[model samples]
Every structure is written in C-alpha cells, then in structure tokens.
Target chain A: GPSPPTYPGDDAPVEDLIRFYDNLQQYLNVVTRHRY
Target chain B: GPSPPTYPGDDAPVEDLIRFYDNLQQYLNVVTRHRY
Candidate 1:
C-alpha cells in the first residue's frame, strides 16, 4: 500500500502514532530548527 | 522485490492458541471421540 510507517502498530488502527509523528516533525522543524 | 507479498495472513492477528504443544505434532487429546 503506502510507505512503511515509521511508528509502532502502524497498521493496527492506532491514531496516536500518527499524531505523535506529525507533532514531532512539526515541532522539530517550526520550533527547534527555526526557533521562535 | 516484486509486489503482492506471499506467505502472509497465514496466522491470524487474533488466534485461539491450542494451549498445549509437544514437538512437531501436538497431542490433541480426543476428549471425547464419537464413532459416527
């Protein structure tokens, strides 16, 4: 199907994984990397 | 590799284990064998 998810229970219908990954990527890029 | 992975979905994500095993063949004690 799509790309291999980079989190646990990727295909087990757990939405928490998606939220966690998305939030991390955003925070790291918008806050950590780009600073306030 | 090619698409359509094989040797998959053989065992279920949720399976009812036999609860006992002994080597290659499990000794399924015929709790009640009927001659029909």
Candidate 2:
C-alpha cells in the first residue's frame, strides 16, 4: 500500500480537502467493517 | 462508537476542517498499524 498523506495545508484547495476526506472515510469504513 | 461525520460544507472553518482531518489521520494510523 502507498504511504499515507501528510497534512494538507490551510491554503489547500477545497476540492482536494474534500476528496481526501471522502477517501479517508471510505478507507475507515472498510477497515472497521473488516476488522482489519 | 459514534457515527461517522457527514461532509463538512465548503464554508466550514479551516480550523474545523483541520481538526477533523487530524482526527481522521490519527484513526487511520491506528487502524493501519494494528491491521484492524
């Protein structure tokens, strides 16, 4: 697996932040669901 | 465990977004570290 992302700065684009957030949500969902 | 958060709006405060992002990062770190 790829390394995790560093902090997106305060000036980061909204779209980028939103996309990262969504991706993390999906990842977390899978992690919790599979207990892995 | 608490339900996951919904999308923080485009107008969300930067601090709020950062805090949420930090929290998610921590959660992901734990999940991946333990493979759980």
Candidate 3:
C-alpha cells in the first residue's frame, strides 16, 4: 500500500472532503462496473 | 492496531466511506493534538 497522505491541516476541510467523497464514489463506481 | 475491517458486498458503500473518512479525521486530530 502507498504511504498515507499528509496535509498541512490537522483535519481535511469540507472542500477537500467533498472532493474526496466525489472521487471515492467515482472510484467505487468504476471498480464496481468493471467487476460486475 | 486492530484487525482490518470487513464489510458485506464487493466494496464499501458511500455511507461507509463517509464514516470512515470522518473517523480518520478524528483519529488524525487526536494524534496531532497529543503530538503538538
């Protein structure tokens, strides 16, 4: 596995989270589609 | 560290990721607080 990501802040902000959530969904969808 | 979490189905759902991300943030925050 890759090293854990490091950021300046103690916590990820809403913008980053929303983007993360969106990307996560995209990743999950892509993987699911290929597998199914 | 504890055993890796297992989930039903092929991949974790959006809900799970959201919760996981939140927990990750919380964990990071706690660790950062102790360190700083």
Candidate 4:
C-alpha cells in the first residue's frame, strides 16, 4: 500500500483523505469523496 | 509539472529540471523511507 497516509488529532480520516485528493476540487470532489 | 514536493526550512532545490524519470534516486528515497 505504499505510504498509506494518516491524519492525527480527533478526526476520522475520510476528511483527511479528502484533503489529500481535493487539489482539483469541484468536479474532482465526486471522485475524491468516494472511498472505493 | 504535476505536483511538486517541497522541503521546508534550509530548503535549496536541485534548481532545475532533470527529468522525473532520471530522478530514480527520488524513487529510491521513497522506497527507503517507506514505513511498511
């Protein structure tokens, strides 16, 4: 899985995952929001 | 140019383009720092 990313603090990382892939924003949000 | 990786503080870039493919050392560095 390479360097599987992580997020600290009291937050579940779906948002953290979003942070990683949200660079494109808007339309990209559709793809970034889906985990599978 | 894709996404660029940055190193903060005391940062001095390689200062030019040497081709991502020629930068096999970067790949090696990633392979080495790999957490698992």
The best candidate by TM-score is: 2
Task: Tell me the TM-score of model 4.
Answer: 0.17
> Can you list the residue pairs that collide in candidate 4?
none
lDDT tens digits, residues A1-36, model 3?
212222223244545544444554565455445543
Q: TM-score: which is higher, 1 or 4?
A: 1
Better of 3 and 4 by lDDT: 3
Candidate 3 iRMSD in angstroms: 9.4
The 10-residue segment with the lowest total lDDT in model 1 chain A: A1-10
lDDT of 2 by residue, A1-36 (tens): 322433464345445545676765554454445543
Q: Please estimate how well model 4 matches the true structure, expressed as its whole-model Cα lDDT.
A: 0.29
For residue A9, what is the lDDT in candidate 2?
43
Pick by lDDT: which candidate is best?
Answer: 2
lDDT of 2 by residue, B1-36 (tens): 322333464345445545565665554454445543
* Cα lDDT, model 4, residue A22: 31
Kindly indicate the candidate among 1 and 3 with the higher lDDT: 3
Error of 1 at B26 (Å): 37
Better of 2 and 3 by DockQ: 3
Q: Model 1's A-chain: what TM-score?
A: 0.40
Residue pairs in candidate 2 whose N, alpha carbon or C atoms collide under 3 angstroms = none
Q: Candidate 1's residue-wise lDDT over B1-36, tens digit each? A: 112111122132211111111110111112112311
Candidate 2 ranges with C-alpha deviation above 4 Å: A1-36, B1-7, B34-36
Ranking by lDDT: 2, 3, 4, 1
lDDT of 4 by residue, B1-36 (tens): 222332221122222112222232343344334532
